[PDB]
Design a protein around this ligand. Structure first.
Ligand code: HEM
Ligand SMILES: O=C(N[C@H](Cc1c[nH]c2ccccc12)C(=O)Nc1ccncc1)c1ccc(-c2cccc(F)c2)cc1F
Length: 441
């Protein structure tokens, strides 16, 4: 039982085009006009099957790569993380590799983090929000704090000194400068692509070059950072990581967070400041108002369940990553239908999070809601490939919120909360809507 196919009106580009303008509405359209939402868009002549049903998510996450591999679809990353580094490494290694990062971003590895990140914020604002009140772009400053903060946590002083955040940021940016989201048909498209790499690849090298130097430098003198920790790692056979792979994993760490976290932090501030949500804002404050000026792990990790709620909804309502794809290397059965081998198969947070059965009044941002279908919230993916940085991210967000709101109040210079800008790789509030006003308490 092949799933319905939205008929293709213009031979080569219509869906890719139609999705670009309004994917949510587009996708829903197929759900709507084919009745049963396990449809199959065609993108480039690639049959693409979207699993639109919360109930049948489980089928999307669970099958192991040898049945549903992202290695094929995410190939575009390969210049960035490095040849053989991640999805470009056979699954024993990839799994091994990913597993090592995860172990660096575990809640154990956070003992000292909160003040570090809490610092950078108090530092940043003070430096960029001098006046009692002023006007700033929110997206950007969240963007600056996110990056800034991560570095404070995940990188050592020598290292931080040798390559400061701003430079990283530019470094990182050059790397997406490469990226082209063909992922839906992306794999095949790789014929002789222009060195979109050329800009980035240089960037990877410069990072690596640096990374070596600290290692060389550090060892001379006589250490627990992200770099330090990855080096200690050993594969199951018993080989260590090659700084090439080390450099890649670090890139992954900075890469995943940069937009998703920024967008998340931002939305969350955006919704909380808005006047509709006074109620929620007051709730937060009771939560955070007795927190000691100095902030420590426990306040954030343990004593902030609501705030977490707020972040999760923000992601739930407008998730940064619109969808997830796997390459079907074997025929598999989703509910009634069956999906061909060789059909790229995708699952979308953006859609499932607006299925009205599981998220009714999806556009209402309620931090206190709870999914009415399990695994409907997939903002951080699910099953095998669960996000491995989410705990870290949340940590970042919840701290920025407590710190910012605690000493500031914000006024949204737009009548309504912004509109999502879908014209980006990772989807966020529109940069222009984001103007926002701040008043030192
Ligand atoms: C707001 C922040 C974030 C959001 C919303 C987010 C969301 C997600 C989602 C939905 C997935 C599943 C993608 C898929 O199944 O292909 C995922 C996977 C992943 N995320 Fe994140 N993520 C975030 C932050 C991070 C950070 C900071 C890291 C840092 C390393 C990270 C690393 C990963 C990795 C490695 C995977 C892949 C799991 C695998 O391939 O097995 N993420 N993330
Ligand atoms: O920007 C993207 N991907 C980036 C880099 C990245 C790719 N594979 C990863 C696996 C782990 C970590 C990072 C990445 C990333 O950072 N993703 C990420 C994933 C998990 N956690 C954190 C971050 C990206 C965004 C959108 C689309 C897209 C959406 C809808 C339709 C469509 F056709 C394309 C595709 C994208 F490739």
């Amino acid at each position: 039982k092949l799933p319905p196919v939205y008929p293709v009106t213009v031979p080569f580009l219509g869906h890719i085009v139609q999705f670009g303008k309004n994917p949510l509405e587009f996708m829903q359209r197929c759900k709507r006009d084919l009745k049963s939402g396990v449809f199959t868009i065609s993108i480039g002549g690639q049959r693409v099957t979207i699993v639109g049903d919360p109930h049948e998510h489980s089928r999307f996450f669970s099958p192991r790569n040898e049945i549903l591999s992202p290695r094929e679809v995410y190939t575009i990353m390969t210049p960035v993380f490095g040849e053989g580094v991640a999805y470009a490494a056979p699954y024993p290694r990839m799994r091994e590799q990913l597993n090592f990062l995860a172990e660096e971003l575990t809640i154990a590895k956070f003992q000292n983090f909160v003040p570090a990140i809490q610092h950078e914020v108090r530092k940043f604002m003070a430096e960029n929000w001098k006046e009692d009140e002023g006007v700033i772009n929110l997206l950007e400053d969240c963007g600056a704090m996110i990056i800034n903060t991560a570095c404070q946590c995940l990188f050592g002083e020598d290292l931080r000194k040798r390559l400061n955040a701003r430079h990283f940021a530019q470094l990182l940016s050059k790397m997406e400068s490469s990226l082209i989201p063909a992922a839906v048909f992306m794999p095949w498209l790789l014929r002789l692509p222009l060195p979109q790499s050329a800009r980035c690849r240089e960037a990877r090298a410069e990072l690596q070059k640096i990374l070596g130097e600290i290692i060389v430098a550090r060892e001379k003198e006589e250490t627990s950072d992200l770099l330090g920790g990855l080096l200690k790692a050993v594969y199951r056979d018993g080989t260590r990581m090659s700084l090439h792979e080390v450099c890649g994993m670090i890139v992954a760490a900075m890469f995943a967070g940069q937009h998703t976290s920024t967008i998340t932090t931002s939305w969350s501030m955006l919704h909380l400041m808005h006047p509709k949500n006074k109620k929620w804002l007051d709730k937060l404050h009771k939560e955070i108002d007795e927190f000691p000026a100095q902030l420590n792990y426990d306040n954030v990790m343990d004593e902030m369940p609501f705030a977490e709620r707020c972040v999760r909804e923000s992601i739930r309502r407008d998730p940064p990553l619109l969808m997830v794809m796997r390459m079907v290397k074997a025929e598999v059965k989703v509910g009634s239908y069956v999906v061909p081998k060789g059909d790229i198969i995708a699952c979308s947070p953006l859609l499932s999070h607006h299925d009205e059965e599981a998220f009714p009044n999806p556009r209402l941002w309620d931090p206190e809601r709870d999914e009415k279908v399990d695994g409907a919230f997939i903002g951080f993916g699910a099953g095998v490939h669960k996000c491995i940085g989410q705990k870290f991210a949340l940590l970042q967000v919840k701290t920025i919120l407590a710190t910012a709101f605690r000493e500031y109040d914000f006024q949204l210079l737009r009548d309504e909360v912004p509109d999502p800008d879908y014209h980006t790789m990772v989807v966020g509030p529109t940069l222009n809507q984001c103007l926002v006003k701040y008043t030192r308490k």
